[PDB]
């Protein structure tokens, strides 16, 4: 038996979901933090 | 977390599950491909018999040529597994 | 019949955010208890 | 901005030269890797008999069984290609 044939993946989809997501995060980050040392301080 | 989609088989619905496990242990094992790879090359080599060949990704393409009822091609999450014999 | 492997010079744009969004999330989650920790004793 | 780096070889210099050749011209015509792919394994089943496989791509690993003085894993600008023979 002999069969001949190929693939391609497809990948690359949901990449701006994540980039956004990451700037999401990171930006919700940074402004965590500082509200916890502008907590820290107080107590 | 990342479940099985086979793209296309010619292949056993046994050896295709089979395959489908492999993978998923292999990956338990190893995070980088050329072992994931060979971890599975390996062991198809030894229940199913010589030769078989594999390829593992997520952005690759490929050109093959295999036996009758052993190709499969599949992703485990986002990355691609080829797996088939010849030889 | 010689067996043998490659690898391509890891790796993907794509691996990388996915891991980032973990490293984030992770630290974003224990960055609110914290948070509500201080929240609590105020 | 895609000079040829040979990673590995267990192959003829002329051999070499010539997988180096086809991937070349298969990127000329072609795109899509699963192409280049194709075109390069169907000439190195014409000129140096069968049976060849070839992988195309950028983010892949592998584990593979080859032939004595069959065997190429080269990159064409950021593109890697395994190309080998077993049958």
């Known amino acids: 038996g002999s069969v001949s044939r190929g693939t391609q993946?497809?990948?690359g989809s949901?990449?701006?979901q994540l980039e956004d997501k990451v700037e999401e995060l990171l930006s919700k980050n940074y402004h965590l933090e500082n509200e916890?040392?502008?907590l820290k301080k107080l107590v | 977390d990342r479940k099985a989609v086979?793209?296309?088989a010619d292949?056993?619905?046994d050896m295709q599950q089979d395959a489908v496990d492999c993978a998923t242990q292999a990956m338990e094992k190893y995070n980088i491909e050329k072992d994931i790879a060979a971890y599975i090359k390996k062991e198809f080599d030894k229940?199913?018999?010589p030769?078989?060949?594999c390829i593992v990704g997520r952005n690759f393409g490929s050109y093959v040529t295999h036996e009758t009822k052993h190709f499969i091609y599949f992703y485990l999450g986002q990355v691609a597994?080829?797996?088939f014999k010849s030889g």
Do not use: Q
Request: net charge positive; proline share 0%; hydrophobic share 40%.
């Open chain 1, 36 to 38: 916890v040392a502008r």
């Open chain 2, 47 to 49: 229940k199913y018999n």
């Open chain 2, 51 to 53: 030769t078989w060949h």
């Open chain 2, 81 to 83: 597994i080829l797996l």
């Open chain 2, 11 to 13: 292949m056993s619905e």
């Open chain 2, 6 to 8: 086979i793209k296309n």
């Open chain 1, 14 to 16: 949901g990449m701006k």
């Open chain 1, 9 to 11: 993946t497809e990948g």
